[PDB]
Amino acid sequence: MNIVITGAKGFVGKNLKADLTSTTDHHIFEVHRQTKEEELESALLKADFIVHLAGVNRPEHDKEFSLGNVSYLDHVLDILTRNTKKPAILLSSSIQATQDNPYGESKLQGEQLLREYAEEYGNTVYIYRWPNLFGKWCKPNYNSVIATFCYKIARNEEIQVNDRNVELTLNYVDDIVAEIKRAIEGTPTIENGVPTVPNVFKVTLGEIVDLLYKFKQSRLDRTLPKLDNLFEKDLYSTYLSYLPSTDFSYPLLMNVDDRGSFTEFIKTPDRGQVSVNISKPGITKGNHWHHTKNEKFLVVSGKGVIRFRHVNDDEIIEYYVSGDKLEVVDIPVGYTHNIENLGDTDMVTIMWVNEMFDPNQPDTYFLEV
Amino acid sequence: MNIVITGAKGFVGKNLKADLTSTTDHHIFEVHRQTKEEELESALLKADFIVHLAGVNRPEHDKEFSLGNVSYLDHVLDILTRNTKKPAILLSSSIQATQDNPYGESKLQGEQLLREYAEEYGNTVYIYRWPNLFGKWCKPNYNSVIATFCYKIARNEEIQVNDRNVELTLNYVDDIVAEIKRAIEGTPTIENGVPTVPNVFKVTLGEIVDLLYKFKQSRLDRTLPKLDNLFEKDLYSTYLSYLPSTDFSYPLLMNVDDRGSFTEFIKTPDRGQVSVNISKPGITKGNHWHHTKNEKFLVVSGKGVIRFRHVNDDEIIEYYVSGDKLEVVDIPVGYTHNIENLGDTDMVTIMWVNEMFDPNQPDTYFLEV
Ligand SMILES: [Zn+2]
Ligand SMILES: [Zn+2]
Hints:
It is classed as oxidoreductase. The structure is a homodimer of 369-residue chains. In chain A, 28% of the residues lie in helices and 31% in strands. Chain A is built from 8 helices and 22 strands.
């Protein structure tokens, strides 16, 4: 199936294009601002589906043309008249089509033009009223506040927020791309009798700003986004996409002594934390118990033994363990425990713990064995 | 300071004893059922604080004595008459002291005996009305339903629940021990003008049972308790303490091929998941990108390179990385990426990912480089 994407160099277009060529066998024809007139006609006539993502004015519109019909949709539809196959057309209109600002009125004229055209020529049309959008590949410093904020914050550049209480209505680019694909396969999502992209968010600029600063500072405090809040999850991914390409990595804090090292990896207030222990050959660590703190030890390299002895008891219990067979040892409360490197190489143990380490109120008590 | 713990062989006593000898310099004198009469007198006369945890009847009470004063508190107070120092006394009474069941009435008689005694002899008294208790070291199959449930469930033994809607009022042993220690240092927690252990929970048997089965099944599904629900956190620790001593470990599921292995460690619905990748020397994995899935790679053994290339782009970006210096590489969306083992030994990478892996709806697209 031949699919043309107008506005192909825009945010949604680049996203839709990358997806479609990856997840389908459709032939994708990209049209944009720089597209020569003859190859536009060429692509449109071959087309089985039109995804119309272009802005309202033609690429040729500049200071000269203040007067004159400069409607790009009109021109696109004008060409499709000769299209033998009656390709379906998807129009990205805006929720501003109800408002009486000139942008909305423009968008409402586009819908109306397309409805009239469809009724005469038979094309099936999917007309969406999209809210503001966000996601990877949106140009920063150019009419998208989220992209601008992500770009600046990731660079320690200061941002300008006039009113934190301003509410934004938003769709994430993934939902836009998924919806377009549903329309392509012939089953749009219908709410209130109209095609509607799911998962719209309503968020204040203040919430957005706090989230972005949290994502930034999370690097240093080893914390993690709340990933079952859909907006926050989508926002975190989009934030990551604005990272300078030299800044994808960050050093961890290793606690180093004669025995090896202990290093925190990720910390959460609600699902514990994970760290990396490295022990030099011959080394024993631990010999302590807890009332309530508990751990999962997972040896991923080298070999050794994890030992237990109930506080009120004499029996030592040994778990022989190595990176050749991956197995978790829970560390039950009320058992003193130790871990020993029995091999010739550094032993590395991943340790999940149920709470944060606080040496003020430690919950760990020295007891050998 | 000399501290005597009556009922020292009980659940709270064992717990308090382990803590006190670990976190303080106090001399701890344990008295219990088997304690000879002369060493009871001996301990009580030396005492600076009495922690009275014993049951209402004397160790000597058996079928013979249906008639007669068999009050252990009375006897204990009777001896303390000769105690020159006026040691403070902590009494663990019960919230049943208000109810007119014989257990409550017993407890109310103990309080009343102690208040009268204090008023004549001057001892400062801390009288608590504790609810039901839970925590490690509570005997299973003996009047504690939580201990019984934990013990049976951890052994795949079937449990008997009559009414799931029965509500329990509970304190966790840690709060009991911490409170006793506060009373010892002279600053009890006061609510409503009376000493009161904080953090009482109110929970149905049904909630308890569901939580315990979740903790059990979590072993197989790699999931984790919700650790910012205090009850659930305390319950999880207590559950662990009932594990058979041969059953502290569990194997993970390694996905093994010619290249090494991939193994899931922990999975959460709200803070992502962590897995372990192991690559044999010379191996490259990845060469894919995501729309929204993102990862943190942390190399903990061996050495190699993590590579990136923006989907719309030509520039390959390389992060040289090894277990000698622990550093996280974020994997931003819209970048195809790969990881290669450059050393002579297996390379092990810990990978956090923001969502569950679903190869039905995969969010990963093959693209080299
Ligand atoms: Zn430990
Ligand atoms: Zn990946």
